[PDB]
């Protein structure tokens, strides 16, 4: 006769969803002076994080079911919006613009400011990008801001930063994160090299389109993951084993004017350019890009055919879909990126100040003018591809970019209490 | 046959060893704006999980015990496997899933058939 016995501390778990919390590096605590994501309201990371490799644990993973992506979706948007609550409405500035060309990507516009200094009116001028404003059809000399008839746009408070600090996300007590350490593992299915993680590595909240950058290189080969590689409704995520260097710049030493439009209220606008007008652009090593791209094809052809023609020029969607984009030095560049795919490298880039947190509903944020020149560089580490076997760059939203990193982990809940039959009866 | 071992891994998931072997590390497992909201909820959940296990161990009279035996016999209708088949040839992760549907049954039996009954019998004996 076997008897019921209770065992506590049983090493089992069930898959579960909970909230992960942030953990900061060291510096982020004191970056509150400007940085939105690198907040002071965040505990530190573990200076000596542990990891345990499990011997016989094999589990199913599915990156497209990874709920951590939703948490990152909401957190970035919420934090970004919170930081803009005290910022300046540009509503009264949309009233009028009399424009000529800058002495036409950039317009030199004069304007009439409505009662400002209590009982006074004033006139000013500023430089505007053609991507932020549009002409009046029956004038062709007068302009308005594009988003004015839908919603409010504010100018980010000058004391702001979006530096993409690699914040870590940690599980609460009672929970653990299991990591798939199988370098050849695709987006779904079983993984045998599994380890227990209490907290993940830091992930930079990088915002970009048509580019995976500044992290997560592949294990000495191009690694491609997709929900199917079959269905045209699905997309392909490409990891490179080597990064490709890109150097971007906006070589215009610009200044900015503070315009007061009433006592107690003001905003900044692009002022005069110190020096000549230089085109924003980015330098991509051609050989590295195309040598890598040849290697990408070597991996891609495994699913799509050995003589299959792949990788054509960007096409489809509006200019923010078609052009490649990033915040270089905080400045927003929209690059044609067709040279990279002009065969199945320096690109021109355009500048725009009205931006979305990936995509807003109605509202938008205005990027204050930046004094001086823009210089930055980065590591190209991957691609997202569009099915047509022609592939084109782009597609998806922030969750596809978050997923491209989060695919390594899943969350489980520890279930330590259970029973089993024994030969031992309770004594009384 | 040389006794080399008695080492520590950590975590010890119930796949790496059998239920019998796994029982040797119960102390291991035991040892193991919006931001405010998250800090709060995280702490609340940790408390809730902790207490739920303690509440069950409490009512069963198994508080403070890694292992406790009850007054309730095993019913083969829950599982008709032998002691060896369960303890030496299976790990907890696989085995528990087979009787998951009897959890509330057994938990209830080990409360009333054991402590309510045992304590009433003993209280009466102690009045003499």
């Amino acid at each position, epitope marked *: 006769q076997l008897w019921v016995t209770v065992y506590y501390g049983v090493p089992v778990w069930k898959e579960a969803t909970t909230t992960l919390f942030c953990a900061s590096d060291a510096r982020a605590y004191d970056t509150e002076v400007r940085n939105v994501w690198a907040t002071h309201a965040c505990v530190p990371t573990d200076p000596n994080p542990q990891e*345990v*490799v499990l011997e016989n644990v094999t589990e199913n993973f599915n990156m497209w079911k990874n709920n951590m992506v939703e948490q990152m979706h909401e957190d970035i948007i919420s934090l970004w919006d919170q930081s803009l609550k005290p910022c300046v409405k540009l509503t009264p500035l949309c009233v009028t613009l009399n424009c000529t060309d800058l002495r036409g990507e950039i317009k030199n516009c004069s304007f009439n400011i409505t009662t400002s200094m209590r009982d006074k009116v004033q006139k000013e001028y500023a430089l505007f990008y053609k991507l932020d404003v549009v002409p009046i059809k029956n004038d062709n000399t007068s302009y308005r801001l594009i988003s004015c008839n839908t919603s409010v746009i504010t100018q980010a408070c000058p004391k702001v930063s979006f530096e993409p600090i690699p914040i870590h996300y940690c599980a609460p007590a009672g929970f653990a994160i299991l990591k798939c350490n199988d370098k050849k593992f695709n987006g779904t299915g079983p993984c045998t090299n599994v380890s227990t993680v209490q907290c993940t590595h830091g992930i930079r909240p990088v915002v970009s389109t048509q580019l995976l950058l500044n992290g997560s290189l592949a294990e000495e080969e191009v690694v491609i993951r997709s929900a199917n590689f079959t269905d045209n409704a699905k997309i392909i995520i490409v990891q490179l084993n080597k990064s490709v260097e890109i150097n971007c710049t906006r070589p215009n030493n610009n200044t900015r004017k503070s315009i007061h439009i009433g006592p107690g209220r003001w905003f900044y606008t692009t002022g005069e350019i110190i020096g000549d007008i230089r085109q924003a652009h980015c330098n991509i090593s051609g050989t590295k890009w195309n040598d890598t791209l040849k290697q990408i094809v070597v991996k891609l052809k495994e699913q799509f055919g050995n003589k299959t023609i792949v990788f054509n020029h960007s096409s489809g969607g509006d200019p923010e879909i078609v052009m490649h984009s990033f915040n270089c030095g905080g400045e927003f560049f929209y690059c044609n990126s067709t040279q990279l795919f002009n065969s199945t490298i320096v690109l021109p880039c355009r500048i725009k100040q009205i931006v979305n947190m990936w995509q807003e509903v109605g509202k938008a944020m205005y990027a204050p003018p930046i004094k001086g020149q823009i210089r930055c560089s980065s590591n190209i580490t991957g691609l997202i591809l569009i099915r047509d076997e022609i592939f084109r760059p782009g597609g998806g939203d922030m969750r596809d970019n978050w997923r491209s990193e989060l695919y390594k982990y899943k969350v489980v809940k520890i279930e330590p209490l259970g029973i089993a039959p024994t030969k031992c009866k309770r004594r009384v | *046959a*040389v*006794g*080399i*071992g*008695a*080492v*520590f*891994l*950590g975590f010890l998931g119930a796949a790496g060893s059998t239920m019998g072997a796994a029982s040797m590390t119960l102390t291991v497992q035991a040892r193991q704006t919006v931001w405010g909201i998250k800090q709060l909820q995280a702490r609340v959940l940790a408390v809730e999980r902790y207490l739920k296990d303690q509440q069950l161990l409490g009512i069963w009279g198994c508080s403070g015990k890694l292992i406790c035996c009850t007054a309730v016999p095993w019913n083969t209708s829950w599982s008709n496997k032998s002691y060896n088949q369960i303890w030496n040839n299976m790990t907890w992760m696989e085995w528990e899933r087979e009787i998951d549907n009897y959890t509330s049954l057994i938990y209830t039996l080990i409360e009333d058939s054991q402590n309510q009954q045992e304590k009433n019998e003993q209280e009466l004996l102690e009045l003499d």
Partner: antibody
């Protein structure tokens, strides 16, 4: 799970040598380590083993008071400490891991690359 | 542990059958580990508890025997197997290995 040993050494008789072995890819304290030596022209000589968790050791009778093992878990590294070196101590010093199923030696499938010591 | 091994010059051709014998005066019951080693390399395990084939070790390797007398058989010898072979005895310690035998070219 791999074992990584330090470099080679040249010593004169009467000297001592210390050979490290790092626990890459696995928990240092979760699997006991053996030390085995192979002098030129020789088969495999067991020197002893160390428990990375507790510090417990066993050594061959041949080396009592001569071969010692130590460990420092903060760097996941075990060490072989050999004194009174003589010409018979020329050889390859290897670190290795067993399965220790049931905490008893089974056989060793994970080996370091071995380092040489010349004496 | 008081182990006697087959003559070291165990010549064989590829696809041939070569065996290594490990017979000790002391019993280990089954606590014997079979190893394969190349010059310049650490020895590695083939068979444990005198009969369990380690995953990753080719199916051509098998072993028989008990108590004191164990034999390692390579049923279809390949070029990569022209290695030395050892037994390690675990009844007690020191857990030394035998002198080792070698498979030679026929």
């Amino acid at each position: 799970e791999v074992l990584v040993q330090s470099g080679a050494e040249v010593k004169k008789p009467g000297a001592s040598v210390k050979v490290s072995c790092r626990a890459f890819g696995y928990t240092f304290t979760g699997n006991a380590l053996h030390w085995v030596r192979q002098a030129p022209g020789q088969g495999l000589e067991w020197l002893g083993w160390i428990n990375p968790h507790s510090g417990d050791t066993t050594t061959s009778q041949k080396f009592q008071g001569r071969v010692y093992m130590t460990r420092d878990k903060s760097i996941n590294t075990a060490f072989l400490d050999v004194t009174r070196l003589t010409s018979d101590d020329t050889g390859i010093y290897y670190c290795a891991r067993d399965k220790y199923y049931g905490n008893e030696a089974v056989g060793m499938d994970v080996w370091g690359q071995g380092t040489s010591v010349t004496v | 542990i008081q182990l006697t091994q087959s003559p070291s010059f165990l010549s064989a051709s590829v696809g041939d059958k070569v065996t290594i014998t490990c017979r000790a005066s002391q019993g280990v019951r089954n606590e014997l580990a079979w190893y394969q080693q190349k010059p310049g390399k650490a020895p590695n395990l083939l068979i444990y508890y005198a009969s369990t084939l380690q995953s990753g070790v080719p199916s051509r390797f098998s072993a028989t025997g008990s108590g004191t007398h164990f034999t390692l058989t390579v049923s279809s010898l390949q070029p990569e197997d022209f290695a030395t072979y050892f037994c390690q005895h675990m009844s007690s310690y020191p857990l030394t290995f035998g002198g080792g035998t070698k498979v030679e070219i026929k």
